[PDB]
Structure 1
């Protein structure tokens, strides 16, 4: 079964300044007072989040 909903208010999405969000834990390890340099799949700061 499938019914056409229609009423498509076709509006474009906007852009927002992603400031510092999107930082996760790159590995499964504990570090205490350690500044660690990683390289992994990340979201850059001040990005254009939709």
Structure 2
């Protein structure tokens, strides 16, 4: 069978603290 990945599979891109921003990143994501 096949299902859908409803907004799943997000990880932290690097080892850097960030707070109260919006960050654009380009990488291998689901």
TM-score (ref. length: structure 1): 0.57
Extract structure 1 runs of 4+ deviating beyond 2 A.
Answer: none
More strand by share: 2
* Structure with bigger gyration radius: 1
CA RMSD in angstroms comes to 0.6
Runs of at least 5 residues in structure 1 that lack an aligned partner in the other structure = 1-13, 44-50
Larger relative contact order (Cα-Cα within 8 Å, sequence gap ≥ 6):
2
Runs of at least 5 residues in structure 2 that lack an aligned partner in the other structure = none
